[PDB]
RNA sequence: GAGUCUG
DNA sequence: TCCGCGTCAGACTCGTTTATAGCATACGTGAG
DNA sequence: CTCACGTATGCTATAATGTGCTGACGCGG
């Protein structure tokens, strides 16, 4: 049976007719008194096989003896009832009868094929009308329609020498009539003489279609079925209920509608019917097997018995539930329990309670086998009953196989890999399972009743690669990021923070002691508190500059909690480590140098400690929560009447006439977001220190040791967010809309809401857990298209030797830097020599894994932009180097090979986003959003430096800033770029380009709210095309009148305006165009949707000034709802709805043509002689003047970049980096920590396919799109041997695509779209060799990666010979 | 949905023109439904159920 | 836009010609002498009757289009047996042929397990005599109430009413995934058998050569055929007591080797 | 674990031998797939080495 | 080892690896009951094979060498 | 299948 | 206008209506 | 070797001859 490969192709009439032991003649199932197969019917025993092993109808034969025994009397096979699940049957169908799949499915074979459209087709198959078939008088040619009456004429006339039909004989004949090679030519012939653009698509389309029908061998009668296949009786079963009654599959229902209608038709032309009801029948017949093949496709699916309709064959394979996803992707499985899981804190981080009777079932084999070797059973049925009686002996021998036994602990829903560990487990009485604490966090577990699934590793391989690959000690480092998952939290955090933190004098001020020891002594001895002030005498031990530990000893001032800590610390940490109070923060920090400095055994025992230690301090500590704990500032009342007056005087102002709906909204959100601050400011001051204790003598000031603000400060559980709603201001609440409510709440949960604050609270709250169950699953289905496309890439190659890399700059957005050049290239792969300054010198090599240590080295010669090996840049064919991807963030060390790397990057993108769906939204009520992004004010001293601007210096003496894309950044002295500051348009700069500024300068002022029409030029304002009405709306004032403009976009506009773009247009005194310096374009500023103009027209304008205010109403709210579409749209590679246009070549440009005012944009390169000329929209304003030397890809309009245009012209790591900084923008926003790495193997399973021109050696021709390792290998061979080059394309494929466009249909039909993948795979006659991962777990095979891979690679070489 | 007359429209949704096309739906508790609706181009139609 | 086979179908009977008394009497005396134009128009022009009896014949087993297609194998059978000479119209004699067709057809394929007509006319009998009683009887139908009513054997009405407990689409409200394969054995049981099978090999070169010679010879354990006490005189035994004596010999001994072993009792529950 | 049947008894015999070694199949979800695409009539064959 | 297999795979390398050849050696004790290197100190054949990789006794390469030897010993004995 | 749930 | 998608397990319960002539010969297999 | 038992195909004569649920998701290609 072990096989190569799979091949899918149409079925002919003779090959179904080969499967079938028979022909079912009858729908006869069973009989009701004797419940035996009945005759020739549905579960015939003469051709399904024998209901009973081994054993005939009538029981003539029976026993294992006879074998293959045909009984002669009733006709029944004499083998196993197995193989009623195998034998097919067969129908003969009276008429000829089109299959669904190849009809209906988009876009269609039959008709494609014919070249005529679905509608002809139907006409003729429900007999509303004949088609011409051929007639050698080209009277009637070919296709051609005929209705009755139609057929009647040409019939008198003509007749006989010409062939119409109609119904499925028609579409066979004209099939069976129809020349593949020759329509092949004649296509061919049409596409030299005139190739219209978009119709050699659809040529060009049909003719791979010709050729591979060809190819593939199958024959396009047999899209018509004449004969009709019979699934297996045991895999359509009728069984008998319990209650006496059947049940039985609706493919039952429906082969018998098929039968019923087919008998019927032979009957009606045995009687030779009149033919009306001959053409009924066949109609009938058709309608029933296309509801049996594919029930719902042909129009109204046929409802069975409550009215649901029947489910049919397409339906059991194709849906999610069909058999891909259910039973085959993913299954039930023996060996496997669950139950409630509860803390076990007693336990070491690689063990697990599990419950007694749990245990003693799920390992009953083992417990038989180790029965049997003591010779305490004497067999398997002694052993089972001794097992169900319990007996005492039993327990010991159970606890003997557990023994060393790891099991795998599941959680749903497993979103990354530490969703399944191992653990040993430890035997307990109770029905509870028991996990340990510091593996909640890869869990998600929270103990308020989940519950887990056990699994048992069966074999020895299973058994190691649990405790090796799946151990919870093993697996410390998120594969994500490289920071530890293993880390403390809630009790344990709090518990140190107790231990390590300070408090004025206490008991023992100023004591001294020998060693930790003296100090435990003290502290439990009640001579001292865990917060006094003590100088202590502890021994760190460094490590040097070899594997050798140095020893020093010194006097150093601590607390007695933090020298007791010391004892807990591993030697080769230095004491710093424990000498500051400890939040999580700084434990996460203290568990990953361990793990750098000592190893992985020292940091699992170390963790298991702190955790000890943690809890038995948190619990002596006695910390709790009285309603006193949560202090109200008491200048609360005072700020919130202060901002409630302001508030009141906008909103009497806005009858008055300053304010639209949009700028009130935003004032008054301004004005609550500052307060909450404020008030929230005022709290933590008074809460966070406001400690009054008298040291040895006088007062003093320190930190609080309020509950609440401990919990807070140390990061146990609530942030500060959550401690402004207790003790501050509940703030301003956001309607599931995500629009803020105008009303904050101004009271907190311990002051209590009234009835009117909490019914407003509700609409944010149930937004929120509405959004858990319903976005869950957007988050989950791009969690899968990732994991789907990215099934296949695992690392191949140790090293592919490739010089090629992506240069990684230090990400510095929003002043602070937000991610540092060391972390983002610690672990790559370095490439070219990259050394020091003063370049005389090499200081680092090529190929070397950027360690803790090189990152430090980077630090002090502060580098700024590393080329380092990339996996999209990786030359390996079918998968990628582990020089290419660097470290395996979750082991700490360079990738192994054979490490599946797609599925970790696909789980590791999906996870953070789907569990910050459920995460962010149930935790919290309202946004608590901050918008003032008003001015930049600078933090550091230094020089401005403007990167990307034209701007216009307007009469104020001010840069008013007029430039898309600009770049503030903050130089120091020795010239290195520190801090970052997107300057928008319409702003003022304090200061112009290269001036200093001093510490806390504001360097420009902007309004957020309304991005201003910012005019060059001065003169006076014309109103071009700006009618009323049409194209904008006139609103007018009292007593003296002052109208306002708003600009009707073509939304609310008539259509009348619909072809007229409104502009202010800016003319001189003489009335004649003013000019924008230097060029040959009069001003003219195309106003958008509601441009809300005040000044009205006549008026002289200065330069630099304010034309138009267009309202920019950002109703968004800080969640991943409104960020994972980005990120979506990203992966999908989605052109937006205005994408900014790109130079295609290098060369120098000046205009052509123009229609009316849309561009003709003619660039005409200097070397390169041909031009290339582009259409432009008139109102879409260009960023370039005129004769500019522009290179490859340069931004000509406003508007953001589509990846499919930066890839065609910049390249892979240019459209590679967009990706990855556009994504992470999002993730970044929500505090999500992914490495870049993890994107760009995605983004390379994108780049997969190519378009090639001309031909090779091969069949490339014209736009065929092939695999690019593939064209690789092709350029190799033929760069060697010569033969025709060719030249190709990268072509950009987002996700869904992608994942279809791979050479496997097991993985494509796995995917999604199941019918119409399979239809294009077996007309091609494709033949899937089962490379992929989803393939071979789908067959029930060895993975091609991890512990596979060494097996895979054996059999690949076993192709080369035996 | 209580029986009587609803005015509804959809808030863009069809034609990136985005304009905004009002509709009646008058439900009765028993019967055929009986729909008016604008066209972009100012048209009102009726559709019977 | 006319895609149903329905549609299609009643306008291509609307199409046709209606008859009258004297035509029917002209077409049926050459349809009966075998006419192919008279036997196509009388039947294409009495489709519409078929129509008017399959209308009120929907939502009872099969379809509109069902019922109308096996109602037009009655009108056939209705042409083909037509009495011209006879007054009585045609559309009396058609009437019949039509119902009785559409009856039959729908007493058969309704039914998943097919329900013979004998049974199918009892059933009949049952339902209307219950539809009476619970007119009377504010209450249903009783089983022996029913059989009170027709004075048949109680036994008889029940397996009747069970006939007619129909069954639902095991796919449809899954439950294939809850009812579990009962002749499949568990791996557990099946092992079970391996060690018994295993064990029968060891136990046969454990006993006498005499005492397993004929003890297996006869369950058909080694031997080919299972036979009885009589028949293992085929082989060499020839005997009626000493193979009875010998059978037993052979599993007295046998019981004591799992007596010792440490089964007997152990292995008696299972 | 699944639906592999030979493949599961066999595995069973051999954790109560204390082999430990699984001896796999090929699993009848699978067989089923196939004969769900025949009875559509798609040929889908298993091509050999 | 025991706790962590941390030095097991410093040994040979490939977790992968590791895992094949733990496998294989604890085969060899399985079936073949073939003698532990270290004292067995009541450990499954999982362990075993981990502690004698650790120390350096087992490794892909040294149990083909001993399988040729027990091989060639076989063919000796056969012809 | 229609439910009410637990994460 | 159509058709294709839309987290992952778990717990339980329910549920499977309808009317359809009667009687005589004919076709076919089983039991005594 | 013959009849009963289970199942099936047969014929009947006033005239009658044209149908008939549930609606509303939302984004993309
Ligand atoms: N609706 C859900 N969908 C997916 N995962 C969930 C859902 N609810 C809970 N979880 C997982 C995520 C975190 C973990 C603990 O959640 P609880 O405490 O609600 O269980
Ligand atoms: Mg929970
Ligand atoms: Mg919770
Ligand atoms: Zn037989």
Redesign the pocket.
Same mark, same amino acid.
């Given at each position: 049976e072990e096989f190569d490969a799979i091949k899918i192709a149409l079925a002919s009439p003779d090959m179904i007719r080969s499967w079938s032991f028979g022909e079912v003649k009858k729908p006869e199932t069973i009989?009701?008194?004797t419940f035996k197969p009945e005759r020739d019917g549905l579960f015939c025993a003469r051709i399904f096989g024998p209901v009973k092993d081994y054993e005939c109808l009538?029981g003539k034969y029976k026993r294992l003896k006879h074998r293959g025994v045909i009984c002669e009397k009733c006709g029944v096979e004499v083998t196993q009832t197995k193989v009623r699940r195998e034998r097919m049957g067969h129908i003969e169908l009276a008429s000829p009868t089109a299959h669904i799949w190849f009809l209906?499915?988009?876009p269609s074979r039959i008709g494609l094929l014919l070249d005529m459209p679905l509608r002809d087709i139907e006409r003729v198959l429900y007999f509303e009308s004949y088609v011409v078939i051929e007639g050698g008088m080209t009277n009637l040619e070919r296709q051609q329609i005929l209705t009755e009456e139609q057929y009647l004429d040409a019939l008198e006339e003509f007749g006989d020498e010409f062939d119409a039909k109609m119904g499925a004989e028609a579409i066979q004949a004209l099939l069976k009539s129809m020349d593949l090679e020759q329509e092949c030519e004649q296509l061919r012939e049409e596409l030299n003489e005139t190739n219209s653009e978009t119709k050699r698509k659809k040529l060009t389309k049909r003719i791979k279609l010709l050729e591979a029908f060809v190819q593939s061998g199958n024959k396009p009668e047999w899209m018509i079925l004449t004969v009709l296949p019979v699934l297996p009786p045991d895999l359509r079963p009728l069984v008998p209920?319990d209650?006496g009654?059947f049940?039985t599959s609706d493919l039952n229902d429906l082969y018998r509608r098929v039968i019923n209608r087919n008998n019927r038709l032979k009957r009606l032309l045995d009687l030779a019917a009149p033919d009306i009801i001959v053409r009924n029948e066949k109609r009938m017949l058709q309608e029933a097997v296309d509801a049996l093949l594919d029930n719902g496709?042909r129009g109204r699916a046929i409802?069975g018995?409550?009215?649901?309709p029947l489910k049919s064959l397409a339906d059991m394979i194709?849906?999610?539930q069909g058999r891909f996803?259910?039973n085959l992707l993913?299954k039930?499985v023996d060996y496997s329990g669950?139950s409630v899981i509860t803390v076990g804190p007693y336990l070491r981080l690689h063990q697990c309670g599990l419950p007694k009777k749990m245990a003693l079932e799920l390992f009953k084999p083992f417990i038989y086998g180790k029965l049997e070797l003591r010779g305490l059973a004497t067999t398997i049925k002694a052993a089972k009953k001794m097992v169900e009686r319990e007996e005492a002996v039993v327990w010991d021998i159970l606890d003997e196989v557990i023994r060393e036994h790891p099991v795998l602990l599941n959680?749903?829903? &497993?979103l990354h890999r530490l969703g399944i560990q191992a653990f040993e487990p430890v035997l307990i009485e109770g029905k509870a399972i028991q996990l340990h604490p510091l593996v909640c966090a890869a869990y998600?577990?929270?103990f308020?009743?989940?519950?887990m699934?056990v699994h048992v590793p069966l074999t020895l391989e299973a058994q190691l690669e649990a405790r090796a690959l799946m151990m919870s000690t093993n697996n410390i480092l998120s594969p994500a990021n490289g920071e530890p998952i293993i880390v403390p939290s809630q009790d344990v955090v709090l518990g140190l923070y107790y231990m390590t933190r300070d408090c004025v004098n206490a008991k023992g001020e100023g004591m001294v002691l020998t060693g930790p020891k003296e100090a435990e002594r003290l502290y439990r001895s009640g001579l001292a508190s865990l917060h006094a002030r003590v100088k202590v005498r502890i021994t760190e031990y460094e490590k040097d500059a070899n594997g050798e530990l140095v020893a020093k000893t010194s006097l150093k001032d601590t607390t007695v909690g933090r020298a007791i800590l010391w004892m807990i610390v591993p030697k080769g940490l230095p004491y710093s480590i424990v000498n500051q109070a400890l939040g999580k923060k700084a434990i996460s920090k203290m568990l990953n140098t361990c793990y750098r400095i000592l190893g992985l055994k020292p940091t699992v025992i170390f963790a298991d400690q702190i955790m000890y230690t943690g809890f038995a301090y948190a619990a002596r500590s006695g910390a709790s929560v009285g309603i006193d704990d949560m202090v109200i500032p008491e200048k609360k009342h005072e700020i919130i009447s202060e901002a409630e007056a302001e508030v009141a005087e906008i909103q009497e102002q806005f009858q008055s006439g300053l304010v639209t709906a949009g700028e009130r909204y935003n004032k008054v959100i301004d004005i609550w977001a500052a307060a909450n601050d404020r008030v929230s400011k005022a709290m933590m001051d008074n809460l966070q220190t406001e400690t009054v204790i008298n040291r040895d003598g006088q007062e003093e000031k320190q930190v609080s040791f309020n509950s609440i603000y401990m919990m807070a400060d140390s990061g146990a559980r609530g942030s500060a967010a959550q401690i402004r709603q207790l003790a501050g201001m509940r703030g301003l609440m956001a309607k599931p809309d995500g629009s803020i409510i105008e009303t904050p709440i101004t009271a907190n949960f311990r002051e209590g809401l009234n009835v009117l604050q909490y019914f407003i609270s509700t609409h944010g709250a149930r937004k929120g857990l509405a959004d &858990?169950?319903?976005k869950?699953?957007?988050?989950?289905?791009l &969690?899968?298209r990732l994991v789907d496309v990215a099934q296949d890439l695992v690392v191949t190659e140790d090293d592919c030797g490739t010089h090629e890399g992506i240069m990684m700059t230090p990400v510095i957005e929003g002043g602070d830097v937000k991610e540092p050049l060391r972390d983002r290239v610690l672990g790559r792969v370095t490439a070219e020599d990259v050394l020091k300054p003063g370049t005389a010198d090499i200081l680092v090599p090529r190929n070397t894994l950027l360690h803790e240590q090189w990152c430090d080295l980077l630090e002090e010669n502060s580098v700024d932009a590393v080329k380092v090996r990339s996996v999209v840049s990786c030359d390996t064919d079918f998968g990628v180097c582990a020089h290419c991807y660097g470290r395996d963030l979750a082991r700490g060390h360079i990738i192994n090979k054979g490490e599946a790397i797609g599925v970790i990057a696909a789980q590791s993108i999906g996870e953070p986003g789907?569990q910050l769906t459920m995460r962010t939204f149930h935790i919290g009520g309202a946004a608590s959003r901050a918008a003032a992004e008003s001015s930049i004010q600078v933090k550091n001293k230094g020089s401005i430096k403007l990167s990307n601007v034209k701007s216009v210096v307007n009469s104020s003496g001010k840069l008013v800033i007029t430039s898309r894309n600009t770049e503030l950044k903050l130089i120091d002295e020795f010239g290195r770029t520190k801090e970052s500051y997107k300057v928008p348009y319409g702003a003022v700069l304090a200061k112009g380009d290269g001036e200093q500024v001093a510490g806390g300068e504001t360097v420009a002022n902007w309004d957020p709210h309304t991005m201003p029409v910012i005019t060059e030029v001065s003169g006076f304002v014309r109103f071009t095309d700006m009618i009323d009405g049409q194209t904008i709306t006139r609103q007018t004032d009292e007593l003296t009148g002052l109208s306002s403009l708003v600009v009707l976009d073509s939304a609310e506009r008539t259509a009348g305006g619909k072809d007229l773009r409104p502009a202010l247009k800016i003319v001189d005194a003489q009335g004649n165009d003013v000019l924008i310096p230097g060029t040959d374009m009069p001003a003219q500023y195309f106003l958008p949707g509601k441009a809300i103009v005040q000044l009205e027209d006549g008026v002289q304008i200065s330069s630099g000034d304010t034309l138009a205010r267009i309202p920019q109403e950002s109703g968004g709210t800080k969640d991943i709802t409104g960020g994972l579409?980005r990120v979506a749209?990203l992966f999908?590679a989605?052109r937006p709805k205005e994408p900014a246009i790109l130079a295609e070549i290098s060369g120098i440009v000046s205009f052509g043509k123009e229609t009316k005012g849309k561009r003709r944009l003619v660039i005409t390169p200097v070397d390169g002689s041909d031009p290339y000329e582009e259409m432009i929209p008139k109102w879409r304003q260009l960023n370039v003047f005129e004769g500019e030397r522009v290179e490859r890809g340069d931004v000509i309009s406003d508007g953001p970049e589509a990846p499919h245009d930066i890839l065609r012209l910049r390249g892979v790591h240019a459209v590679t980096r967009y990706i990855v900084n556009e994504v992470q923008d999002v993730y970044r926003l929500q505090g999500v920590k992914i490495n870049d790495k993890h994107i760009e193997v995605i983004v390379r399973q994108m780049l997969r396919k190519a378009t090639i021109v001309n031909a090779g050696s091969s069949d490339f021709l014209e736009g065929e799109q092939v695999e690019y390792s593939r064209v690789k290998i092709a350029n190799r061979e033929l760069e060697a041997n010569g033969k025709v080059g060719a030249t190709y394309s990268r072509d950009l494929l987002?996700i869904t695509?992608a994942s279809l466009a791979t050479e496997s249909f097991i993985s494509a039909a796995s995917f999604?779209? &199941?019918?119409?993948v399979l239809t294009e795979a077996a007309v091609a006659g494709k033949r899937d060799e089962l490379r992929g991962l989803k393939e071979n777990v789908i067959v029930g095979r060895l993975i091609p990666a991890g512990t596979g891979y060494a097996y895979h690679q054996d059999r690949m070489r076993r192709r080369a010979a035996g | 949905?209580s029986p009587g007359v609803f005015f509804d429209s959809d808030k863009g949704?069809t034609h990136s023109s985005g304009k905004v096309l009002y509709n009646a739906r008058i439900?009765p508790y028993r019967?055929?439904?009986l729909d008016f609706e604008f066209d972009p181009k100012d048209n009102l139609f009726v559709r019977?159920? | 836009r006319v895609l149903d086979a329905?549609?299609l179908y009643?306008?291509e /009977?609307?199409?046709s010609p209606?008859?009258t008394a004297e035509e029917?009497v002209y077409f049926a005396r050459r349809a009966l002498r075998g006419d192919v134009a008279s036997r196509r128009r009388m039947i294409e022009?009495? @489709?519409? @009757?078929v129509?008017?009896i399959?209308?009120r014949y929907?939502?009872?087993?099969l379809a509109?289009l069902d019922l109308i297609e096996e109602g037009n194998l009655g009108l056939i059978?209705a042409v083909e047996?037509?009495? #011209?000479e006879?007054?009585?119209?045609?559309?009396?004699?058609?009437?019949?042929?039509i119902?009785?067709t559409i009856?039959?057809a729908?007493?058969n394929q309704?039914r998943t397990i097919?329900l #013979?007509?004998?049974?199918?006319?009892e059933?009949?009998?049952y339902?209307?005599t219950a539809?009476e009683l619970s007119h009377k009887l504010d209450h249903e139908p009783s089983a022996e109430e029913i059989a009170e009513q027709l004075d048949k054997p109680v036994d008889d009405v029940s397996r009747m009413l069970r006939l007619?407990?129909?069954?639902?689409?095991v796919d449809? #409200?899954?439950?294939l995934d /809850?009812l579990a394969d009962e002749k499949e054995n568990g791996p557990e049981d099946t092992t079970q058998d391996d060690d018994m099978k295993q064990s029968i090999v060891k136990w046969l070169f454990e006993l006498n050569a005499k005492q397993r010679e004929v003890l297996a010879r006869r369950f058909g354990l080694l031997g080919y055929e299972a036979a009885t006490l009589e028949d293992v005189g085929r082989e060499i035994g020839l005997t009626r007591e000493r193979v009875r004596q010998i059978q037993v010999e052979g599993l007295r001994r046998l019981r004591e080797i799992l007596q010792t072993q440490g089964l007997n009792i152990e292995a008696l529950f299972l | 674990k699944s639906d592999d049947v030979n493949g599961r008894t066999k595995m069973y015999k051999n954790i109560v031998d204390g082999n430990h070694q699984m001896e796999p199949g090929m699993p009848e979800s699978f067989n089923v797939l196939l004969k769900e695409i025949r009875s559509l009539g798609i040929n889908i064959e298993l091509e050999d080495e | 080892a025991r706790v962590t297999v941390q030095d097991a795979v410093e040994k040979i390398g490939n977790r992968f690896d590791l895992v094949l050849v733990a496998a294989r050696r604890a085969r060899q004790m399985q079936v073949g009951g073939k003698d532990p290197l270290v004292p067995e100190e009541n450990d499954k054949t999982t362990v075993i094979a981990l502690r004698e990789i650790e120390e350096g006794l087992i490794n892909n390469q040294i149990l083909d060498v001993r399988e040729r030897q027990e091989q060639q010993e076989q063919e000796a004995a056969e012809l």
């Open positions: 009989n009701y008194r009538c209906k499915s988009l209920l209650g009654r049940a496709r409802t018995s409550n009215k649901r194709k849906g999610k996803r259910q993913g039930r669950r959680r749903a829903p &497993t998600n577990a929270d308020d009743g989940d519950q699934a &858990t169950a319903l869950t699953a957007n988050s989950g289905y &969690t899968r789907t579409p749209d999908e989605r987002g695509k999604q779209e &199941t019918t119409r | 949905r949704k439900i019967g055929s439904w019977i159920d | 329905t549609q009643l306008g /009977i609307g199409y209606l008859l029917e022009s009495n @489709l519409r @009757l129509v008017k399959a209308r929907g939502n009872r087993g509109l059978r047996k037509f009495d #011209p006879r007054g009585f119209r045609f559309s009396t004699y058609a009437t019949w042929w119902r009785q009856e039959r729908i007493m309704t097919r #013979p007509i004998h049974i199918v006319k059933l009949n009998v339902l209307r539809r007619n407990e129909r069954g639902t689409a449809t #409200p899954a439950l /809850i | - | -």
